[PDB]
Amino acid sequence: ESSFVEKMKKTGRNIIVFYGSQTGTAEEFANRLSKDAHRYGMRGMSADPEEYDLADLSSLPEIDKSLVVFAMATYGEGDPTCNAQDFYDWLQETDVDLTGVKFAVFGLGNKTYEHFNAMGKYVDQRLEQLGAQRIFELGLGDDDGNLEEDFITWREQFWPAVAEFFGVEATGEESSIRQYELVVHEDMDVAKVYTGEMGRLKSYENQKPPFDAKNPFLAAVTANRKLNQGTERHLMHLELDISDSKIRYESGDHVAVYPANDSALVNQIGEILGADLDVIMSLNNLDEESNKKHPFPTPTTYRTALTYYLDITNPPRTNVLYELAQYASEPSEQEHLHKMASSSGEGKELYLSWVVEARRHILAILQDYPSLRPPIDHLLELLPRLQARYYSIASSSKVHPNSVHITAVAVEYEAKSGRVNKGVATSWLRAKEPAGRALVPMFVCKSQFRLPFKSTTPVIMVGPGTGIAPFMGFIQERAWLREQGKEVGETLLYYGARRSDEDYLYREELARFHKDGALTQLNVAFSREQAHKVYVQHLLKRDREHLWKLIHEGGAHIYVCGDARNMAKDVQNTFYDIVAEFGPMEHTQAVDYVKKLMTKGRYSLDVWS
Numbered sequence: 257e258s259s260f261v262e263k264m265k266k267t268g269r270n271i272i273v274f275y276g277s278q279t280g281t282a283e284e285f286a287n288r289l290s291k292d293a294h295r296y297g298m299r300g301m302s303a304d305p306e307e308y309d310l311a312d313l314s315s316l317p318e319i320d321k322s323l324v325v326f327a328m329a330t331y332g333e334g335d336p337t338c339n340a341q342d343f344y345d346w347l348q349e350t351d352v353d354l355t356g357v358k359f360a361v362f363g364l365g366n367k368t369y370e371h372f373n374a375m376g377k378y379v380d381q382r383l384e385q386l387g388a389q390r391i392f393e394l395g396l397g398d399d400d401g402n403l404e405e406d407f408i409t410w411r412e413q414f415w416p417a418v419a420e421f422f423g424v425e426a427t428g429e430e431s432s433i434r435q436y437e438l439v440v441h442e443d444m445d446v447a448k449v450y451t452g453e454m455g456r457l458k459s460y461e462n463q464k465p466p467f468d469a470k471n472p473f474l475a476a477v478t479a480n481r482k483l484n485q486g487t488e489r490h491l492m493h494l495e496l497d498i499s500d501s502k503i504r505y506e507s508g509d510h511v512a513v514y515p516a517n518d519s520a521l522v523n524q525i526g527e528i529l530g531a532d533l534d535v536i537m538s539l540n541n542l543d544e545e546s547n548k549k550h551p552f553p554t555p556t557t558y559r560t561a562l563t564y565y566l567d568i569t570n571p572p573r574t575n576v577l578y579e580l581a582q583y584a585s586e587p588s589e590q591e592h593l594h595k596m597a598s599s600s601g602e603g604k605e606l607y608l609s610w611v612v613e614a615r616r617h618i619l620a621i622l623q624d625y626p627s628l629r630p631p632i633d634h635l636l637e638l639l640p641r642l643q644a645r646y647y648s649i650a651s652s653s654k655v656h657p658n659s660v661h662i663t664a665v666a667v668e669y670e671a672k673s674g675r676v677n678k679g680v681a682t683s684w685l686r687a688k689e690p691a692g693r694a695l696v697p698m699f700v701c702k703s704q705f706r707l708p709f710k711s712t713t714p715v716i717m718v719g720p721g722t723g724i725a726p727f728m729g730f731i732q733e734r735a736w737l738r739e740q741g742k743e744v745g746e747t748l749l750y751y752g753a754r755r756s757d758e759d760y761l762y763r764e765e766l767a768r769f770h771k772d773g774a775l776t777q778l779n780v781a782f783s784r785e786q787a788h789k790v791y792v793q794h795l796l797k798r799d800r801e802h803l804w805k806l807i808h809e810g811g812a813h814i815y816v817c818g819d820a821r822n823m824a825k826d827v828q829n830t831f832y833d834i835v836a837e838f839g840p841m842e843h844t845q846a847v848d849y850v851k852k853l854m855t856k857g858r859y860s861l862d863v864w865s
């Protein structure tokens with residue numbers, strides 16, 4: 257029954273939709289597709305592949321008229337989402353015969369990235385190779401345009417093709433309107449109420465391994481200090497105690513945390529809607545046959561839902577604004593909301609500008625449209641789930657097996673909406689003061705940002721500002737290896753900053769590593785000081801000769817990390833120029849050479865946006 261197949265049989269499901277999602281876009285699509293099954297007299301369920309063994313696809317043919325659908329997002333360099341990692345690894349190893357398996361894939365991607373929808377394309381071609389039968393063309397959603405309409409366009413052709421394949425047709429029955437109904441609990445034991453846990457009730461208090469996305473380990477914050485000298489920004493370094501969790505990690509991996517929305521913002525929303533946030537309740541699916549019993553962990557209070565389970569800071573979706581329109585008592589306001597939710601060009605234009613680019617959130621919409629008074633229960637099923645935030649672990653498990661370090665800048669800005677916005681996780685992390693204990697629900701997500709297999713292999717690290725994070729772990733580890741008597745190749749760091757007196761992160765630590773010979777070269781650039789701005793790509797260019805040697809003769813591995821995609825672009829272009837000059841070779845040939853390094857695993861990236 258731990259098999260998704262047996263799980264399906266239990267509830268008479270013939271359609272299962274797996275989601276490879278990291279920020280919830282794919283998950284929601286899977287939820288919608290699963291729900292769609294019903295409009296055709298069939299039954300589906302959405303599912304997190306991480307919770308199952310996809311090799312069980314082999315038993316799916318046991319279910320008559322069964323179909324498996326995949327909504328998969330592609331991340332850094334074509335890599336899968338954290339929750340789809342095991343499925344991806346398995347697909348590459350397996351040679352199982354999937355004859356009799358019917359599938360369809362909808363990929364979530366973005367054309368501006370080099371590996372557009374790589375995950376979607378991989379899963380679709382791989383399943384066919386294994387012998388499964390494609391029932392509908394691969395969908396290629398592009399978030400650089402309008403992912404929603406791509407999904408809608410695919411979906412509208414998908415269902416008729418599936419209904420036809422399985423012999424059914426639309427029922428054309430009631431639309432439903434709302435997906436959940438409100439059930440208040442006048443009296444209820446405190447023991448039955450969720451207080452912020454993600455998986456099993458009281459799983460936060462009764463910490464029991466193994467710990468992962470659905471069972472986060474509450475790590476104690478043992479250190480939380482200010483890294484920068486300035487006052488205009490707040491860069492911080494934190495250390496999370498993972499002792500006794502059995503959680504394993506390596507330099508280059510990521511640590512995800514489930515934050516808590518600002519208590520004051522939660523209060524405001526409750527107040528503007530005139531509701532008692534301390535009311536305990538449950539939202540139950542109107543359709544008793546749906547597998548999605550509740551929108552989030554219930555029973556729980558409105559306060560807890562808004563604080564731990566819901567996204568109340570990002571721009572509300574167009575469908576949310578459409579639904580909200582019916583609650584605006586003022587015509588002009590109702591109409592404005594519809595125009596913003598519409599597909600017209602003016603409508604899209606307005607939404608893009610006034611909602612998205614101005615970074616307005618659910619509270620702002622509520623204040624901006626005072627005639628808008630929706631019941632809080634209906635609002636909660638319209639809001640998206642609060643997502644975990646990922647950070648590059650800045651420590652080496654070889655040196656800190658029981659502690660995971662984080663390096664991050666606190667997010668705070670004046671939005672064009674005229675309000676000040678606060679990053680959800682960084683504001684929450686910033687307030688976590690060591691010593692009861694300040695606990696951070698977290699889990700580790702493996703990455704492929706790994707130090708070379710052989711210690712002798714040279715290492716080149718490029719990263720500006722906070723992008724230095726994973727490299728503190730790398731340097732910690734390389735230094736450790738030297739102490740252990742190993743033969744370690746050169747270790748070079750090309751770091752960029754604004755000012756050495758504003759934000760020159762880890763000065764002391766780097767100086768010590770360099771003095772010990774752990775850090776072969778320490779190259780630092782400051783971009784904000786006089787018209788003459790120096791960036792990391794300039795540091796690389798000034799060191800063209802030595803870098804070419806390490807790359808062409810030394811077999812060095814390259815690593816780039818930072819929050820700016822254009823930074824990675826400029827760094828990459830700089831390496832193209834170095835290869836072109838020292839090969840020597842034509843630019844076009846230099847490009848191929850660098851990309852080859854990437855496919856050969858010698859040029860890794862970790863860009864956060």
Ligand SMILES: Cc1cc2nc3c(=O)[nH]c(=O)nc-3n(C[C@H](O)[C@H](O)[C@H](O)COP(=O)(O)OP(=O)(O)OC[C@H]3O[C@@H](n4cnc5c(N)ncnc54)[C@H](O)[C@@H]3O)c2cc1C
Pocket residue numbers: 510569615645646647648649663664665667668669671678679680681682683722725863864865
């Ligand atoms: C694999 C991976 C690794 C990462 N590693 C790190 C790391 O080591 N360190 C680190 O600091 N971060 C890292 N990030 C970024 C991190 O996940 C968080 O997004 C970031 O810390 C802010 O989260 P928040 O919850 O505080 O902000 P949120 O509340 O989620 O807000 C962030 C959003 O606000 C908007 N925004 C921000 N500033 C502005 C502005 N001036 N104007 C308009 N809109 C704005 C953007 O749309 C942005 O997406 C990583 C991301 C990924 C995907």
Ligand SMILES: Cc1cc2nc3c(=O)[nH]c(=O)nc-3n(C[C@H](O)[C@H](O)[C@H](O)COP(=O)(O)O)c2cc1C
Pocket residue numbers: 276277278279280281282283329330331332333334335337364365366367369370371372373374399403863864865
């Ligand atoms: C750090 C990061 C890296 C990404 N890398 C790629 C990529 O290589 N290729 C691609 O097609 N889309 C890429 N995308 C776009 C996502 O696939 C797209 O935004 C998707 O919708 C996110 O879905 P989710 O919310 O279900 O994770 C990336 C997005 C982020 C945030």
